[PDB]
Amino acid sequence: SQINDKTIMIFGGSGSLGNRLIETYINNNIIVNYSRDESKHWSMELKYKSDKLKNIIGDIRDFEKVQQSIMRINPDIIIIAAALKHIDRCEYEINECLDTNIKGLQNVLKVTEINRSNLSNLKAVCFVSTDKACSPVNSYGMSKAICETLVVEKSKYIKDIKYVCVRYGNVLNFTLTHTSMTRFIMTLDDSVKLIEYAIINGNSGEIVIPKLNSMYIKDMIELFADKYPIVITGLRSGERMYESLINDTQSMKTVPKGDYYHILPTYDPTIVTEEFYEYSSKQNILSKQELENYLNQ
Amino acid sequence: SQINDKTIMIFGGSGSLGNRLIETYINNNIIVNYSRDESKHWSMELKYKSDKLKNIIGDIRDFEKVQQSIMRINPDIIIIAAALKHIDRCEYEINECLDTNIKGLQNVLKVTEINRSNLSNLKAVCFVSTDKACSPVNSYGMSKAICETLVVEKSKYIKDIKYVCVRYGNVLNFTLTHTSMTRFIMTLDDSVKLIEYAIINGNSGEIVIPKLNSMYIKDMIELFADKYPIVITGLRSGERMYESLINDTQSMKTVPKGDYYHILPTYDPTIVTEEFYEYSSKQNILSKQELENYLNQ
Amino acid sequence: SQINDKTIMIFGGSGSLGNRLIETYINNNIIVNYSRDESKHWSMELKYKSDKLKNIIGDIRDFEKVQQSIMRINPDIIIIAAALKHIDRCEYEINECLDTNIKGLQNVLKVTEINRSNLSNLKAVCFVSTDKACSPVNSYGMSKAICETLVVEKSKYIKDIKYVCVRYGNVLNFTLTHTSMTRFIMTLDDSVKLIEYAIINGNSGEIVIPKLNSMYIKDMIELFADKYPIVITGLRSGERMYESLINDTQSMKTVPKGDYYHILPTYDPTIVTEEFYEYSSKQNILSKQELENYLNQ
Amino acid sequence: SQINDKTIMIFGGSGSLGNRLIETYINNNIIVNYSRDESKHWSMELKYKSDKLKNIIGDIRDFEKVQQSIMRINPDIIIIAAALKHIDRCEYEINECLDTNIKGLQNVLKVTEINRSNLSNLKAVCFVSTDKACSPVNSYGMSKAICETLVVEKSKYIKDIKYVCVRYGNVLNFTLTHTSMTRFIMTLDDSVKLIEYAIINGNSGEIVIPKLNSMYIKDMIELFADKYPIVITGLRSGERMYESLINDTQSMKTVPKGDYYHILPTYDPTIVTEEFYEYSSKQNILSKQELENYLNQ
Amino acid sequence: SQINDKTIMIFGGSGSLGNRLIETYINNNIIVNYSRDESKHWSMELKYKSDKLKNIIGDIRDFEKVQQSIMRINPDIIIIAAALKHIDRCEYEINECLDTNIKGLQNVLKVTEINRSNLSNLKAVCFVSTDKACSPVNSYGMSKAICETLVVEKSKYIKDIKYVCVRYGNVLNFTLTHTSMTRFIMTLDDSVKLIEYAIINGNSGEIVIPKLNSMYIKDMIELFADKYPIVITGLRSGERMYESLINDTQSMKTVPKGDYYHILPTYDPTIVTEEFYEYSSKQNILSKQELENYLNQ
Amino acid sequence: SQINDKTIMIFGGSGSLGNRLIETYINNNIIVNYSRDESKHWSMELKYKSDKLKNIIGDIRDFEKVQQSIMRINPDIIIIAAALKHIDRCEYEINECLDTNIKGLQNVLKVTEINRSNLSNLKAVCFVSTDKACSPVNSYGMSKAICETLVVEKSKYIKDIKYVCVRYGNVLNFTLTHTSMTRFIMTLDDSVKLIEYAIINGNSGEIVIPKLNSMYIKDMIELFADKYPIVITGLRSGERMYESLINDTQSMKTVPKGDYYHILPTYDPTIVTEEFYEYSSKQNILSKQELENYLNQ
Numbered sequence A, B, C, D, E, F: 001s002q003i004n005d006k007t008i009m010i011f012g013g014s015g016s017l018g019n020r021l022i023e024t025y026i027n028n029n030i031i032v033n034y035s036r037d038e039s040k041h042w043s044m045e046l047k048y049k050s051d052k053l054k055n056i057i058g059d060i061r062d063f064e065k066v067q068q069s070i071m072r073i074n075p076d077i078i079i080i081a082a083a084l085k086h087i088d089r090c091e092y093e094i095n096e097c098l099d100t101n102i103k104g105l106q107n108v109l110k111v112t113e114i115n116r117s118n119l120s121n122l123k124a125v126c127f128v129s130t131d132k133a134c135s136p137v138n139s140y141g142m143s144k145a146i147c148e149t150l151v152v153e154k155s156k157y158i159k160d161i162k163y164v165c166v167r168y169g170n171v172l173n174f175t176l177t178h179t180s181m182t183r184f185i186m187t188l189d190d191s192v193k194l195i196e197y198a199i200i201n202g203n204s205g206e207i208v209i210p211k212l213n214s215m216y217i218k219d220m221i222e223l224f225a226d227k228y229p230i231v232i233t234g235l236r237s238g239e240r241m242y243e244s245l246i247n248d249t250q251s252m253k254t255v256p257k258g259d260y261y262h263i264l265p266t267y268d269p270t271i272v273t274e275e276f277y278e279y280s281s282k283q284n285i286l287s288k289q290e291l292e293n294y295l296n297q
């Protein structure tokens, strides 16, 4: 609604987030998806049936293909959201996540710098991150955490493009990991709104964070086993018990703005507070009662 | 004292840690240093005056040179300790730390796998890490955190070599960052002992951690301003107020063994405790009195 | 049934062909799948629920990851079947098919040569090709055609491994391209049998071809519109009207062996016949009657 | 005669075709040759003795050298004609032809895209192909066939440069391969005229084909053994009995224009005819009588 | 004094020469240092305490980092002075000097050509060479000798930037190599003056040489052993007995201009003299008396 | 005559030297030529008509192709002789000579080290150098000079293979450069004998030099203008007036052995003489009379 008449290029836009972004913006914008699997390209074209949706086959690891594609499109907005789904299998296939996440993003970022003179339209770059990047404890989270610093780094040296990140928890859109596990609650539409908000209202170099309630995963799964038994699988390798969105180091540079928090870039000398805090899914937890009402609505 | 008659190869062994390792082991072992600055090689050769010390000029980033050097030496033990000194300047020179830390280590690790048949002597690989790798908040710490997972990963697939990490805080061997800042106290000899302990007593895939007291950095600097004024500079970019050596996720797989703690590899299904804890420099802090007595001894 | 107690490694084994090969051989063999999408790995593991199935995340384009994986597994048999599904989109994304097909195969083939001494188990390499590689007219077919020559080339220089190809048409397991279009008829199980036959009964350097009936695609689609209207879309870019399995040049070196034909390697001086022929889907075409009976059974 | 006052850059212009192009255009144009062997550069300079001929030493495989050279010259016209002479030795040295043909052309093509802003003069790019690229049966032909699709691909995305191909048979300017072998007859001057015609009259994305008579190679060799015995060597590896210039798939998009045929680009939806045909050296064959009269003139 | 209001970028400017250049020009110019060791960056910043000094962490071997840095700075002047100190250890670590010297310089030079349109400010490039590059006899000298030809080469093709070299002997700012060894005498300030002179008064493609007296190294060391015994170590590997600044081939194209000699570029047809000469430290040697007076002043 | 029953692999063996080596050794040895131009391969095969001669198409720049070829052949002897003919055109195409000479040789040398375990037969490696590598003054000579040090370097670290160089002047097998120009006189057969002598009688790490008379080039050309006028062209770019085979630095480590001189490796501490000398074509020059008698015989 504040993104209109734009060409939006999305790396990894053939998944859930990508398809929701397309549904949301295709009526008023050109959308270019860049991803590897052309089967999904085919099905997407059949769904939207619009010349305003273009797919490019390519791997974000491939600098040449990334550079050629960005220069062909000359987009106003770039959104980076390419990554694997099952985060835990990064742990013993580490090269695979380093390359897709770190190298992929450094490919896109590099084009915006070295080929800046050929990208007259580019105004904003939005990297989609994850709560797993905050105080990370697994390879996937560590790589995403590095990705954020790379975005912050470009924002320091390249002043005429807005570089922002968003960081969020699990999107909702019988098995139980652990009875103590907590997560933040958010929907696929919340993700999209977060992304637009950051593009429009975030400042270059910021990491923007949504204000979310949280739940015991056990409370949720219990509900589903009544509308519709439960096996308790163990923790996966590298998995933590809770989600953290802001840690005490970041909290000192976090400006709260109602529904969203803006983590100021590290190169900003401003100290917001010395009353440090953590923002995690272990606090402000919905009752089972409250969770039931939310899932219902 | 349990490392004798070995050929020990150290990447980045021309600094403080490298020189202490040389002083400690040169009487009974062959030592090969691999690092970039040949001025330090020259001075080191003049100091030790021993044919048992060999220097190779090379960058750990350079896979070809790393591979050729390891295959020439065929060491019993490899220690990786290459990194920059001023950790904060990684933050806007990120490629520089990704390459030296992540790519450098993946070069060494790769040789041990792909060239295993040419390395008949290799028994142990020890990666030297840092408390900044625990719940990391800056690019340097994030990269080191990834390095640990890479070492753990090789330990899963390569069963006939011991791959271990050690993780420690600041080594002690007028300006003040912040009056609230805490650090763990350890000496250069403690570092070395930690490294030997891990090589001898660590198991493949473990990250081994020293039991250390901690101090208010302010308490220390105050002492020095009496034996011998103090400026309070601000926090540097990416710097945290305290050091953390074990976080609550790792604590669930940590086996305490007296003076050292062994973090079991992520692929080990064993749950040691569900009473999670954090091990950080904000707890068990020495009084100024106690710190004075320690610095004295 | 003649493949037992083997470790079989399949590049691109998470699709239709891969899953059928797994169903067929998992009871008596170790199966390793190498492919990019770990979502399919997850679902496959849930289906077969066997420790005899292992997935590796990796791109066949990635020489390092391919080499490391083959050396870890040390398989008896390698099957290469990685490619995209919608063949026509290669035509304006050519780099994408050159890399996955030509470069991917030259990665696997190279490991078998340069790392031969570390692959003590390897006995057979089977490249899965396509009728589109015969007198090719589109980029996908041209790239596959080159792949075959690469397999034939290794077979000339590496005498102690069997390198074979199979080439086949469309696998069966409302829209109409063109009323004149013909295809060969074969099922997913026919594909598998072809692959086993080539591994067991093919000679190194041969390209083995199945004897198949063919159909008017119009005849087929007409049937489905009665059991269950039809739109006639045009030809796609690069698409031919028929499938060809042997052309007149290959026919001179083709040894027929009942249900299969063996195209002798180009370096074999043997001239089988000078009565050249073409083997294509435009000849020996089933009546609608005959096609109905076949689809029924 | 319609190419005047141009700077023409030729990759592989030190051979027969290159030297004829130089003789034809040097009086009125700047000619830059790019090729590997400086002995031929030396001799050529001695022959033409003109400052209007410049040689650059370089391999078309070498992207850096190709890019630097094109940007230095800033030509109006680029002609690509680099390849080996003895086509059959590609068959067991496949990497060599993939690199020179496919990679070489993708180097030149890439410069025209990524460095477009530095190439203000470039108007036309002409790729020189071969009848062996039509329904190809050997590695050389397959690689050239792919080259054509690459040229067609650039023509789709880059609208302000004309990208064209020409495809032709053997140029005429005692041993017999096979008594049944046929070839198209054309001279070195015909080649040049074809190239100019395509540059001037071809449209971007077309492959332009000459109307040629054909001959039994036996008829020709018999003549030479009278003006001036004959050994019948066998077919070489990968060699076909005849030359094909248009196949039945291409025939449906071929516009005949008198002395030349224009194969429309695959992305053009236009269907010229559904009365498909093949254009090959097995049809319209000169009598020995007719061939003698032609060779005479 | 003729370099004012410029941005000067120095590769390898954290050593002796770099620090002197900074002291000399920082009052009136922006100085950017590019080098690997950030410890020296830190100390330098503490010394000069000026925002007019900027350090970039990077290796000259790293084309990407070199290109990104030059394009960020857009300097008026580039000075290349990166190399190792102990020249003799190049001899059995040859790759290390080829990469830092030859590849490093070809990285910088390439940016000035391929990225010329993004470097609107660049006016001069000064390569710092050494007498060891004249009739070289060791790997270090040979590599520097090649570096000079690379600078001369760019000067031929790139007409709107001044590319110059300077070549000099040992800078002065108990052990004896050999009693016969001679060297040219020059100070650190002489080096700087030479560099400025070449930038201002050298022509593109020239190598500019200082007029210097020379000394027996034995004469010097004898003096120091009186103000303040002497060990005679042998020659090092690859070391010559004397320094040569101009050889007889270069002498034929050398224009003397008082305090400096200008070696004309090889592509200049001008023959200055056929009375060839050598300019070396074996001639015009100071007496011990004369050397004492010079060292005193 | 002391090389029998060997497999000899020659890089760049399709030229004059290569063909003479083949004529000399083919009766009693297997010869493998590795070079780029397959036209020369074809003609050579027609000349020798022997299965004992094998050609591989490849560029010495191409590490992969070099490594694959050496491992396929597993030769007893490797001779490196690949370079361009017109030495002066290196001067403004420097990358071309750096790559073919330095990078080409480091490709071959590297295979002998990293793939040593797969090269059970390799006994000797002979690099063919040139007098232009002695006190070099042009890019070609500088690159060859570096090549020699690379060969000497491998000889230091790899003790079970003999690495040797030979260095020689012009081979004899109307225009005048300059009336003062001198050259050493040697024939193509002298070259071959030198090569065999070095392989058999040279020690690892030595550079072996032939004892040769020299001539005024003017004296020679005058003779040819009587048996059969003369133009005096100028010096070419980078050309020196004379050839030097030993310089005063090398002379101190040169052991004379009658018809050949052996330059001891730089890492050999042995000082042969301190009575340094130069060995060049400006001394011991034949009279016109003497030259006439020599050319006659």
Ligand SMILES: NC(=O)C1=CN([C@@H]2O[C@H](COP(=O)(O)OP(=O)(O)OC[C@H]3O[C@@H](n4cnc5c(N)ncnc54)[C@H](OP(=O)(O)O)[C@@H]3O)[C@@H](O)[C@H]2O)C=CC1
Pocket (backbone or CB within 6 Å): A011, A012, A013, A014, A015, A016, A017, A018, A034, A035, A036, A037, A038, A040, A058, A059, A060, A061, A080, A081, A082, A083, A084, A085, A100, A128, A129, A130, A131, A168, A169, A170, A171, A172, C037
């Ligand atoms: N609950 C959630 O789903 C959460 C999601 N996020 C973030 O959202 C983003 C996307 O999530 P979601 O839409 O659910 O993800 P999906 O798994 O549904 O798809 C992600 C996309 O990335 C693409 N991709 C993966 N690897 C590559 C590659 N190497 N090159 C090019 N494209 C690639 C995939 O396409 P293809 O396979 O065809 O190449 C796919 O289009 C991620 O950044 C993630 O960190 C964060 C927190 C929670």
Ligand SMILES: NC(=O)C1=CN([C@@H]2O[C@H](COP(=O)(O)OP(=O)(O)OC[C@H]3O[C@@H](n4cnc5c(N)ncnc54)[C@H](OP(=O)(O)O)[C@@H]3O)[C@@H](O)[C@H]2O)C=CC1
Pocket (backbone or CB within 6 Å): B011, B012, B013, B014, B015, B016, B017, B018, B034, B035, B036, B037, B038, B040, B058, B059, B060, B061, B080, B081, B082, B083, B084, B085, B100, B128, B129, B130, B131, B168, B169, B170, B171, B172, E037
């Ligand atoms: N208080 C402390 O000092 C602490 C240290 N550590 C760990 O200890 C280890 C070493 O510390 P310390 O000895 O103090 O470090 P130093 O700064 O004194 O030296 C580190 C070494 O790394 C080398 N090096 C840096 N970059 C490269 C490169 N690209 N290629 C090859 N070598 C390189 C340097 O040699 P050169 O420059 O010549 O190449 C030097 O020899 C590090 O891993 C660090 O994480 C952890 C916590 C605290």
Ligand SMILES: NC(=O)C1=CN([C@@H]2O[C@H](COP(=O)(O)OP(=O)(O)OC[C@H]3O[C@@H](n4cnc5c(N)ncnc54)[C@H](OP(=O)(O)O)[C@@H]3O)[C@@H](O)[C@H]2O)C=CC1
Pocket (backbone or CB within 6 Å): D011, D012, D013, D014, D015, D016, D017, D018, D034, D035, D036, D037, D038, D040, D058, D059, D060, D061, D080, D081, D082, D083, D084, D085, D100, D128, D129, D130, D131, D168, D169, D170, D171, D172, F037
């Ligand atoms: N009858 C015929 O001759 C026919 C020719 N053609 C086409 O004509 C074109 C040229 O034919 P023709 O002139 O006879 O060929 P030539 O064999 O006479 O020479 C071809 C040129 O390519 C150059 N070349 C080869 N490899 C490379 C490389 N890797 N890098 C740079 N240059 C290279 C050669 O120069 P150098 O070796 O010095 O590098 C030479 O100048 C080819 O594209 C061919 O397909 C098509 C049909 C028939």
Ligand SMILES: NC(=O)C1=CN([C@@H]2O[C@H](COP(=O)(O)OP(=O)(O)OC[C@H]3O[C@@H](n4cnc5c(N)ncnc54)[C@H](OP(=O)(O)O)[C@@H]3O)[C@@H](O)[C@H]2O)C=CC1
Pocket (backbone or CB within 6 Å): B037, E011, E012, E013, E014, E015, E016, E017, E018, E034, E035, E036, E037, E038, E040, E058, E059, E060, E061, E080, E081, E082, E083, E084, E085, E100, E128, E129, E130, E131, E168, E169, E170, E171, E172
């Ligand atoms: N007597 C003398 O000192 C003479 C000097 N010269 C010339 O002067 C120049 C510099 O001399 P001087 O100042 O004494 O040298 P120093 O040894 O004092 O330092 C040289 C500089 O080069 C840098 N450097 C080395 N390798 C690299 C690399 N791979 N990437 C980036 N930077 C690198 C070093 O920084 P860092 O290590 O931090 O990367 C350092 O800043 C050289 O070109 C030399 O040839 C010539 C004749 C005599």
Ligand SMILES: NC(=O)C1=CN([C@@H]2O[C@H](COP(=O)(O)OP(=O)(O)OC[C@H]3O[C@@H](n4cnc5c(N)ncnc54)[C@H](OP(=O)(O)O)[C@@H]3O)[C@@H](O)[C@H]2O)C=CC1
Pocket (backbone or CB within 6 Å): D037, F011, F012, F013, F014, F015, F016, F017, F018, F034, F035, F036, F037, F038, F040, F058, F059, F060, F061, F080, F081, F082, F083, F084, F085, F100, F128, F129, F130, F131, F168, F169, F170, F171, F172
């Ligand atoms: N008077 C003389 O001729 C002298 C010769 N020498 C030395 O003798 C050696 C050879 O001389 P000569 O036989 O006359 O040389 P030629 O010019 O006759 O041929 C040299 C060989 O090198 C090959 N070659 C060149 N570049 C490459 C490359 N990039 N990859 C693979 N092969 C390549 C050529 O084959 P192709 O082009 O097909 O690739 C050719 O076979 C050289 O090392 C030279 O330094 C030294 C002094 C004098």
